[PDB]
Amino acid sequence: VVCDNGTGFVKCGYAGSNFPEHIFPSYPMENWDDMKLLTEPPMNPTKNRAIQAVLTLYAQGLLTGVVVDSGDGVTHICPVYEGFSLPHLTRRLDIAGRDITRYLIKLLLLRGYAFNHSADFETVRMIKEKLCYVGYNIEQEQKLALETTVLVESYTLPDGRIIKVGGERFEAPEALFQPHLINVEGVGVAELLFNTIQAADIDTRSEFYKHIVLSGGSTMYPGLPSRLERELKQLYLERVLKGDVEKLSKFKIRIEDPPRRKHMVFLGGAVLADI
Amino acid sequence: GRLPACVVDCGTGYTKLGYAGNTEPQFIIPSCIAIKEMKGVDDLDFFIGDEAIEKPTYATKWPIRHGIVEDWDLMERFMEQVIFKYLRAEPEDHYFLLTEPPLNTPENREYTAEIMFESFNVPGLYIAVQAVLALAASWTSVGERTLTGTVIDSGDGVTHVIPVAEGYVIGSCIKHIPIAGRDITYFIQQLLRDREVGIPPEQSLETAKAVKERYSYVCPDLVKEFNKYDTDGSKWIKQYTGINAISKKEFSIDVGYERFLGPEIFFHPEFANPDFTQPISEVVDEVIQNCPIDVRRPLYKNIVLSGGSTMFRDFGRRLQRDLKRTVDARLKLSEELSKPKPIDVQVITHHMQRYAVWFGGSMLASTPEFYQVCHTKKDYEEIGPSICRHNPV
Amino acid sequence: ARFRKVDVDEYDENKFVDEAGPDEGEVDSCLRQGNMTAALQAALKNPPINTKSQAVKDRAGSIVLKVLISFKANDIEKAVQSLDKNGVDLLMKYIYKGFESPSDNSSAVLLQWHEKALAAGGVGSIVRVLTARKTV
Amino acid sequence: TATLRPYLSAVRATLQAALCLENFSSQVVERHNKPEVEVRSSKELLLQPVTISRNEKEKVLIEGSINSVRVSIAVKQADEIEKILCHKFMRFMMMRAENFFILRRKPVEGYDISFLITNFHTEQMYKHKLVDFVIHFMEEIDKEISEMKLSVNARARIVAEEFLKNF
Amino acid sequence: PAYHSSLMDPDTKLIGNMALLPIRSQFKGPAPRETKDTDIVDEAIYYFKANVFFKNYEIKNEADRTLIYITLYISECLKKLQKCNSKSQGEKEMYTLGITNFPIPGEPGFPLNAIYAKPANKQEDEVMRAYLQQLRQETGLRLCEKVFDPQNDKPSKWWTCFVKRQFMNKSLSG
Amino acid sequence: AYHSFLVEPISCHAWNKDRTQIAICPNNHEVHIYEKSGNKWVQVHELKEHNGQVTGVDWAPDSNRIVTCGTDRNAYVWTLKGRTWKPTLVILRINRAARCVRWAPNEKKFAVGSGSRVISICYFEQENDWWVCKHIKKPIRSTVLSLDWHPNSVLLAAGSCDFKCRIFSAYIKEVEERPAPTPWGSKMPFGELMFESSSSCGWVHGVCFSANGSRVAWVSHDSTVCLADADKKMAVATLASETLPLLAVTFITESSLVAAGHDCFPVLFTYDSAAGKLSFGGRLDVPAGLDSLHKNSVSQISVLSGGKAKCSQFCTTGMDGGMSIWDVRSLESALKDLKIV
Amino acid sequence: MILLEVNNRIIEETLALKFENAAAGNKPEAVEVTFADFDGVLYHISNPNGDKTKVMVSISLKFYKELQAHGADELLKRVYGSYLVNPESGYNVSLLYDLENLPASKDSIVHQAGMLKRNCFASVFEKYFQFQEEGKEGENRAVIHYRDDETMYVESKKDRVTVVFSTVFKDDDDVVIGKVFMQEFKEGRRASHTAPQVLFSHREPPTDAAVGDNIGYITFVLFPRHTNASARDNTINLIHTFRDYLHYHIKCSKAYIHTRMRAKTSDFLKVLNRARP
Ligand SMILES: Nc1ncnc2c1ncn2[C@@H]1O[C@H](COP(=O)(O)OP(=O)(O)OP(=O)(O)O)[C@@H](O)[C@H]1O
Ligand SMILES: Nc1ncnc2c1ncn2[C@@H]1O[C@H](COP(=O)(O)OP(=O)(O)OP(=O)(O)O)[C@@H](O)[C@H]1O
Ligand SMILES: [Ca+2]
Numbered sequence A: 001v002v003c004d005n006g007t008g009f010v011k012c013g014y015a016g017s018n019f020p021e022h023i024f025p026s027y028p029m030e031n032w033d034d035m036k037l038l039t040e041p042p043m044n045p046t047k048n049r050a051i052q053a054v055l056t057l058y059a060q061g062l063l064t065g066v067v068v069d070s071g072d073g074v075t076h077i078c079p080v081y082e083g084f085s086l087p088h089l090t091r092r093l094d095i096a097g098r099d100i101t102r103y104l105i106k107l108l109l110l111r112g113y114a115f116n117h118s119a120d121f122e123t124v125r126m127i128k129e130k131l132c133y134v135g136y137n138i139e140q141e142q143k144l145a146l147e148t149t150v151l152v153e154s155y156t157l158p159d160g161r162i163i164k165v166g167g168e169r170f171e172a173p174e175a176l177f178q179p180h181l182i183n184v185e186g187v188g189v190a191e192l193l194f195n196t197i198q199a200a201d202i203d204t205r206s207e208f209y210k211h212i213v214l215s216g217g218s219t220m221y222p223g224l225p226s227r228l229e230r231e232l233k234q235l236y237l238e239r240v241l242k243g244d245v246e247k248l249s250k251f252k253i254r255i256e257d258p259p260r261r262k263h264m265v266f267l268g269g270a271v272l273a274d275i
Numbered sequence B: 001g002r003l004p005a006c007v008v009d010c011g012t013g014y015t016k017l018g019y020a021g022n023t024e025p026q027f028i029i030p031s032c033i034a035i036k037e038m039k040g041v042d043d044l045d046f047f048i049g050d051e052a053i054e055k056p057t058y059a060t061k062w063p064i065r066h067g068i069v070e071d072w073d074l075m076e077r078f079m080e081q082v083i084f085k086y087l088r089a090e091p092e093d094h095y096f097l098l099t100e101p102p103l104n105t106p107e108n109r110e111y112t113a114e115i116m117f118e119s120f121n122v123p124g125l126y127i128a129v130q131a132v133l134a135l136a137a138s139w140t141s142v143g144e145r146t147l148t149g150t151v152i153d154s155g156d157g158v159t160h161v162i163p164v165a166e167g168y169v170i171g172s173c174i175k176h177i178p179i180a181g182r183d184i185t186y187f188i189q190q191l192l193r194d195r196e197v198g199i200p201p202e203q204s205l206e207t208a209k210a211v212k213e214r215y216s217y218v219c220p221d222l223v224k225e226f227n228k229y230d231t232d233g234s235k236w237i238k239q240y241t242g243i244n245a246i247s248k249k250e251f252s253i254d255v256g257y258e259r260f261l262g263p264e265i266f267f268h269p270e271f272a273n274p275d276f277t278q279p280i281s282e283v284v285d286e287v288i289q290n291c292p293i294d295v296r297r298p299l300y301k302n303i304v305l306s307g308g309s310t311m312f313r314d315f316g317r318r319l320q321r322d323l324k325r326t327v328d329a330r331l332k333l334s335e336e337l338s339k340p341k342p343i344d345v346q347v348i349t350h351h352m353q354r355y356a357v358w359f360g361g362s363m364l365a366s367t368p369e370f371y372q373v374c375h376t377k378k379d380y381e382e383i384g385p386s387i388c389r390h391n392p393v
Numbered sequence C: 001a002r003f004r005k006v007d008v009d010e011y012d013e014n015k016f017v018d019e020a021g022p023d024e025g026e027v028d029s030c031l032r033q034g035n036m037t038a039a040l041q042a043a044l045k046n047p048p049i050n051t052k053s054q055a056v057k058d059r060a061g062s063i064v065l066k067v068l069i070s071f072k073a074n075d076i077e078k079a080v081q082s083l084d085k086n087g088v089d090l091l092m093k094y095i096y097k098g099f100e101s102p103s104d105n106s107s108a109v110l111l112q113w114h115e116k117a118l119a120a121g122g123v124g125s126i127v128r129v130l131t132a133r134k135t136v
Numbered sequence D: 001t002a003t004l005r006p007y008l009s010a011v012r013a014t015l016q017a018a019l020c021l022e023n024f025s026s027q028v029v030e031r032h033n034k035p036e037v038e039v040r041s042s043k044e045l046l047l048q049p050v051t052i053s054r055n056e057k058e059k060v061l062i063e064g065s066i067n068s069v070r071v072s073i074a075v076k077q078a079d080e081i082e083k084i085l086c087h088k089f090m091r092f093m094m095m096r097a098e099n100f101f102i103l104r105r106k107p108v109e110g111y112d113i114s115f116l117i118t119n120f121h122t123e124q125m126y127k128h129k130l131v132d133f134v135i136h137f138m139e140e141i142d143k144e145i146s147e148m149k150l151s152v153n154a155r156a157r158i159v160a161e162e163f164l165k166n167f
Numbered sequence E: 001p002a003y004h005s006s007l008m009d010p011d012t013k014l015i016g017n018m019a020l021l022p023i024r025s026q027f028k029g030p031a032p033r034e035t036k037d038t039d040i041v042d043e044a045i046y047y048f049k050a051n052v053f054f055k056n057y058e059i060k061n062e063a064d065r066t067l068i069y070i071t072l073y074i075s076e077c078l079k080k081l082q083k084c085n086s087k088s089q090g091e092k093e094m095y096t097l098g099i100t101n102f103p104i105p106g107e108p109g110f111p112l113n114a115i116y117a118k119p120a121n122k123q124e125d126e127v128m129r130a131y132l133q134q135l136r137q138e139t140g141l142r143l144c145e146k147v148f149d150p151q152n153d154k155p156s157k158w159w160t161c162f163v164k165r166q167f168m169n170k171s172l173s174g
Numbered sequence F: 001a002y003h004s005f006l007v008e009p010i011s012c013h014a015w016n017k018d019r020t021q022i023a024i025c026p027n028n029h030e031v032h033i034y035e036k037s038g039n040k041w042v043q044v045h046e047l048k049e050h051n052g053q054v055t056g057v058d059w060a061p062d063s064n065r066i067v068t069c070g071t072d073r074n075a076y077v078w079t080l081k082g083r084t085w086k087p088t089l090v091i092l093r094i095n096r097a098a099r100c101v102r103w104a105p106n107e108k109k110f111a112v113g114s115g116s117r118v119i120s121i122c123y124f125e126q127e128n129d130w131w132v133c134k135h136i137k138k139p140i141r142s143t144v145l146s147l148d149w150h151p152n153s154v155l156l157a158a159g160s161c162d163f164k165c166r167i168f169s170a171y172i173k174e175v176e177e178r179p180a181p182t183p184w185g186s187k188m189p190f191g192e193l194m195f196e197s198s199s200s201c202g203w204v205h206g207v208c209f210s211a212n213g214s215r216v217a218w219v220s221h222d223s224t225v226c227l228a229d230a231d232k233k234m235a236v237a238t239l240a241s242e243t244l245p246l247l248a249v250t251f252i253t254e255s256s257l258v259a260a261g262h263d264c265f266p267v268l269f270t271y272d273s274a275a276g277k278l279s280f281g282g283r284l285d286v287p288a289g290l291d292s293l294h295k296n297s298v299s300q301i302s303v304l305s306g307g308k309a310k311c312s313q314f315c316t317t318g319m320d321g322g323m324s325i326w327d328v329r330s331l332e333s334a335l336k337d338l339k340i341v
Numbered sequence G: 001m002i003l004l005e006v007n008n009r010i011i012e013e014t015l016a017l018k019f020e021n022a023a024a025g026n027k028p029e030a031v032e033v034t035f036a037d038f039d040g041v042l043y044h045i046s047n048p049n050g051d052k053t054k055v056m057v058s059i060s061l062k063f064y065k066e067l068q069a070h071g072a073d074e075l076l077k078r079v080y081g082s083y084l085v086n087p088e089s090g091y092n093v094s095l096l097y098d099l100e101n102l103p104a105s106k107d108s109i110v111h112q113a114g115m116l117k118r119n120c121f122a123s124v125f126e127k128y129f130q131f132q133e134e135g136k137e138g139e140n141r142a143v144i145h146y147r148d149d150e151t152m153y154v155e156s157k158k159d160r161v162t163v164v165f166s167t168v169f170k171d172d173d174d175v176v177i178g179k180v181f182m183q184e185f186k187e188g189r190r191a192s193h194t195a196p197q198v199l200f201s202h203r204e205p206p207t208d209a210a211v212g213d214n215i216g217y218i219t220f221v222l223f224p225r226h227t228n229a230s231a232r233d234n235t236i237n238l239i240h241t242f243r244d245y246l247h248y249h250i251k252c253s254k255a256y257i258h259t260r261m262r263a264k265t266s267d268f269l270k271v272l273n274r275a276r277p
């Protein structure tokens, strides 16, 4: 019986198993009386105490690589070298699920919808999960939103009213790459990921790059994997290749975005617990 | 600017219009338009307000239902006279503040902007949310201004219990009440039908409307009120007169129980509505209880009235009492079934209620802030009508 | 920031990559000699389908266009019907190119030619105009 | 006219050939689905652009792709009053693009109005009817614009008379 | 909401599931004698004009069933009083009307059969019919002094006006 | 014989061995299975697992297994356990949508075409208890729209948006062995490109091998139908059509094809082996707002009985939600002028 | 409504309600109102010194000095007599009504108050209509800047008086619609051969006469039958509203087009939805 307790939802069930037999809401955890194999975040207080990034890579049948786990409160970039993780080289991005949902609420309120951040939080989160996605080329997305109506989807609110969501579908998740959009100092999951790896052994740097695996509910946005790749190719070009367009072809960036990555951590423990 | 902005509050039964800065609208007219039922200039042959109610050769239309614009052609023309006949304002020289029903769509705001910008070339437009204006109007009673409160807007169509948190309406917690000035008039009309004679059939509604506005009030207890009347009819039965428009004759009737029975339907909807039975105090309670825990006491402590049908003497007192009882009863039963601190319930009533929204909009449109949050014509041509989807509080 | 201004896809290696004209004298001669149907055929001979020069393509276009203008309304059908399918197809592409340069009233006549080409090649001949990777 | 029927006939035939679409998941972005004619991120999925012109002013541009088609119309505008009437009318409809699901919010540069018909439209609507619509639309806007022009003129005359006869 | 009886004692007797409430009357019947200066008939008459507008009524005590019965019956009396000219005439007809065999719980014609318990046997039947008749007689007698304005031959319009309204949309004649 | 399952599109379909049940995708994430009862259709199952539109469905006859692929990048193999169908995930390892799928005739493999510009040959290892796959990549340069197996379960024809029809070897020695030489070539290592059409225009919507496998045909967006004959140095016969593009095709005899597309009706094409030329002899649907059975594009066609060597009944599903059944001989006696071979 | 009314409704109703109550014997209510009129006119109705028995009506026109230069004060005095008092600071003319001393025909003075603006304009017209009649030629033109960027020029000649308007069309498309309306004015005598003749020039004057693609010059030629003592008033009522009359109709014209557009668009959506199975 493996149980991965997450900040916002709880995933638990059995070994050898396929997907959590039970997935239900948690708010005791944040990124004990209330609280009352197990998983642990990339910087759990020793005072508080398997590593999740370790479990993720494990389910993939890997021992080395970088894990981008984005859930409800915080996003982590956890590099793991043959066997165990390495806190040093592990970073955080103070942007994840809640922030995107909160941002969507603001955006929908700007277009003229009477949403209340507290009262309608759960409602908009569902809108986020059903309609939001990551833009590959924002410039391109902007044109579609401004010049056509292909992006407009209808959503029926609990009271029966119907609202319309368009450009905001990709605008909210853009927070992940442009923190300033939601008043957050930082560089964006992609640029963050880049640095994290560059700040590593030139020997392993190549091994890591070709082993970036996603994990968590916030990594499910359609297009996320492609946006990351385009972002990394860009950074690499500008910063590592200085600008030689011919070498870009040598950048081997494979971003493992497994079908069951939403709950990849659990998927691990399970299998990692028959062994 | 040297000229004050135009402030227009269109409603199901009446449209309040005037210039920012004034304490009361310069005109309050029926939201109706009379036309002939297009080539030449036939589209201009029309009247609005009172002049359009009795036209022999014209058909009266009501562009607004349940508080929302149903006929844009007609609403647009209605504006033509609102601007050029009544206000007598050069539309290109004045900023305009209009109001909207809660839950007005973004689409509808663009339709209004299209009219105001594309037809009248106004230099600036602001579409205000009625409830917020009502909240602001109440500051005229309350020494600590706040935009968090529960608004009770009761006009002629339907009545709304609108919760407002920090200037922003919590739309998913709004509740409607199938009782309003229109329902109350019809009810009083029936009471008179059963008792008084001589009322000219064509003036039946008219007479009921009069009795309602001139003699009604809300009592604290039905049987006790009924007893005062039977025990001393001399001090409670009034007289109302009028004249038969088709006999010139004069007609008077005794006005009785209808005085307090009329408003009573807000509290006992079943008296006149077979499908609704929730007392207004309960609807309010339910609404607030549906809002976030953190905002509940501030909502209970600031229940503001707005609209013609909230004018009945003692409407606020009754509402406050009944709501307190419900609340006290609940907190008591939970202390028993088990220490919930007592909740402060307060219904605000003020002189500026018959046109609370208009007054709210007037005070806002005459402040420097306003001329900034308003969307200009420049920003309209460049970014499009979408800019009018949101109107900063 | 600044690294997003560069469209890396530009240099992507998976991206797809696609793999002289008629006898002026030949044509004028058939025209001069009144051999209309022969002129159409001569003009539809050896199209610039493989040259990167919009210039030579334009000459080919002008040559073909010239012929189509010369024709007398009541003769267009007979001529079109003499062409095989590959021919009608090509004719259709030249007719669409003509549409891109209205002159005097050239468009009025091009529409009549389109009626005829359509009649002989069917809507499928238009399809092949849109589908062509190498064109006039 | 003598030239209107041939023009609409050539246009109709072209729309029929271009309105042959199917659902196409993006090859460039993981789990995306976009009107290829708009993003143009895969050359092979784009068809050749074609134009049908009635004359030097009136023309239609048809851009096809595997899952979408953009149709742009250059509306007849004989004089100034027609130019502004056409522009207001096109803007009017474009503001309502959402209810007119096959309308583009803005026209392709050089045209007065544009349509963006996708496989989702040819899926939930009979494609031959969408073709009819485009042709029907072309014919009706000219009529409407003519009516508007007569209307403005008609009312202007009465307005001038009403004021003058009162002196 | 509606007005409820407060005369239910911890030792009030029952006839069916109705409360056998005391009344000050001279008419015959099983009604207990009333000492206080207020009985269930006075209560029902004092509340009439208010209760009659109601449509929904929650039954709490078996006393409420007695109160409801008299309320519906008051309507009946008004129907009759409306068409007569003189307190005396009305007095006559309040006796006649009080004597008529109205339907009782369990029978067709008695509205509210789902609410009132049917007499369990012949004794309860006779006793029940007896209590209601007694209630009708006393009610109609008191109702007369109220309806007629001291300017006799004048059933006040302040009572007549209620003739068309029906408590809970029910009628003892429907 | 036309039947309407819905008014929205039937994205794709697959019939069981007895043609007793038909599986269709109602333009969504699900697959509904319908069983015929008398002259009526009854819904009996609903495979709900994909999280995107299902794009391909194939039913292995003997093992009675259904395989589906979708825009969610996944493929599930479906096994009927007693009363309900249970899905088994298949990691395709593709970063784009799956577009089509087909079980090999030997029922030990299945190929999936995708927007990743690759073809994933999947097979089951009864040792680790799951499905794994190998990718055929070169020289595919765009989305693979259609696939069709050669009767030897090794050669595989594919159509793609790079305007080509190709024949590859999908030899997987872990479940079968060295195939007998074929007129297409004698050397067939996994991924070997056996044949590539020579056209630089027209997305190849459908491909199809004949019964014996010596011939392969395909239909493209340039409104043309083609057939390559391996018994003739792989010479390709071509026929341009006067109408809209065909989306599907299948042999019905060794020298006859039936295709359907945006014209919304089936047509016939015949191959003259001696002259190496294709001819139109079609328009089998002889007479909304159309004179055709289907009221929108036909995107799939399958042989119901008689095989591709002598088909007697074939099926068509389209974007109008309709499913039609055509009887070859009935069509022959109804259209006296009809050929067939 | 085709012709624009001349009197101000806010003024009349505010005074009427007040007179009504004064006559009835009720105690006066405090009154404080700010409102406008076309041409940048601003009004103020109030109780001077908070004395509710007194109601003042003031009007402010940025161009009053120009009207004053042409007889304004003298005319306003003739019309208002004792009601006209010292202008309220910030305004040019103020009328004062003593609720305790009203005339027999209250309604008559309510009407004249309603015409305060029109009466301020009246004199420039009477002055020149008078010149023309006494045959006094050569007198200098009158220039009234009724709007920050629009001007009216009045001049008398031997047999006619001319009134020229220099108007501006903000929205460029409004110029086109404008030209259409002016063309009908231009050909007006085809409807009323005795009516004033109208001339129209676009972008070019018929002084500091400006020039511009958005400036339009309308010229009205008034004849003795339009300017004599008998028609003078009606003529003034019409002429001083022309400019606003023109822009009002241009705007109502666009309103009408919208109704057309709503019907046509609505039609198209019907046809489109009929394409759905
Ligand atoms: N399909 C989806 N697309 C985008 N976001 C999603 C999707 N599904 C869930 N989410 C979001 O993912 C978050 C929950 O993911 P997850 O359960 O991995 O986080 P957690 O473990 O509860 O919290 P934490 O990762 O901080 O410990 C929420 O913000 C939820 O709204
Ligand atoms: N003093 C009064 N007492 C009770 N009712 C009054 C009084 N004065 C006016 N009313 C009623 O107020 C109603 C009009 O109120 P109001 O103008 O606020 O509503 P509205 O905006 O026209 O309609 P709605 O708010 O429903 O869209 C009418 O029923 C009128 O009879
Ligand atoms: Ca987690």
Ligand SMILES: [Ca+2]
Pocket: B010, B011, B012, B155, B307, B357
């Ligand atoms: Ca209102």
